[PDB]
């Protein structure tokens, strides 16, 4: 809340993201003044590649459902904290290495997350236990090495949960239990050894699973039995039991 009318290069002091405000807002300068009422009128900003390196300036603006920051350099992004009508957040390839736990805590209404491309090592447990709206969640392409379990448990409602390209070791049997609407899982180019009985039993939505390029190299009894919905089943890449080519006929090789 702003209560004077107030030059956008010092409420948003990134010069890429003021004249970002400035697009926006259809202004002629990044000097121009700003009411409160025109920083209401952003709904969504589109600001993908802009070499943006700080969005502070952000928390003056309630009522944006839709961010697409992806392929900037933002390395804080705690001025995203009250943004309370958030929908679809793209934070994918910037330089975030952490996320402060309680980033997401007032952020209700989030139904698509893309965290993919940065440097998360690690992620908090209960980081995601606010997020009971989320369908799409991105963590792709990171440096991850372990996933703790409850990490997933609120996210009830979730689609699509992508948590390839990382270097994941293994996985707790728990750690899906909650997805029971999960229809694709991308679990490829990782580094697991072996898969825990019961890790898919939860999953009877399932429609797609990619376990591709990982460090398998058996795959225990009844371990799809559950996946009455499976339309795709990739394990390319491993190295396990000789099959024949195609979804039906690998699942009856295996059952």
């Known amino acids: 809340t702003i209560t004077v009318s107030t030059p956008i290069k010092q409420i948003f ?3 890429a993201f003021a004249e970002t405000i400035k697009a926006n807002l259809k202004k002629k300068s990044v000097t121009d ?3 409160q009422n025109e920083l209401n009128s952003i709904d969504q900003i589109n600001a993908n590649n802009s070499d943006i390196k700080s969005v502070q300036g952000i928390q003056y603006l ?3 459902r839709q961010l697409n920051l992806g392929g900037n350099k933002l390395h804080d992004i705690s001025a ?3 943004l309370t009508n958030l929908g679809w957040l793209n934070l994918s390839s910037n330089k975030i290495e952490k996320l402060p736990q309680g980033l ?3 952020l209700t209404t989030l139904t698509q997350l893309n965290l993919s491309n940065n440097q998360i090592t690690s992620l908090p447990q209960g980081l995601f236990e606010s997020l009971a709206s989320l369908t799409q969640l991105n963590l792709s392409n990171n440096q991850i090495t372990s996933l703790p379990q409850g990490l997933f448990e609120s996210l009830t409602n979730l689609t699509q949960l992508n948590l390839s390209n990382n ?3 293994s996985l707790p049997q728990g750690l ?3 997805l029971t609407n999960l229809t694709q899982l991308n679990l490829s180019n990782n580094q697991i050894t072996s ?3 019961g890790l898919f039993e939860s999953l009877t939505s399932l429609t797609q699973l990619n376990l591709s390029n990982n460090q398998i190299t058996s795959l225990p009894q009844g371990l799809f039995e559950s996946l009455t919905n499976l339309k795709q089943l990739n394990l390319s890449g491993n190295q396990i039991q000789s099959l024949p080519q195609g979804l039906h006929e690998s699942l009856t090789q295996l059952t």
């Open 80 to 82: 995203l904290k009250e």
């Open 167 to 169: 270097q994941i070791t």
């Open 104 to 106: 997401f805590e007032s």
């Open 13 to 15: 002091p990134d010069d």
């Open 62 to 64: 309630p009522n944006v």
């Open 176 to 178: 899906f239990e909650s």
């Open 33 to 35: 003044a700003v009411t």
């Open 195 to 197: 898969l825990p009985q």
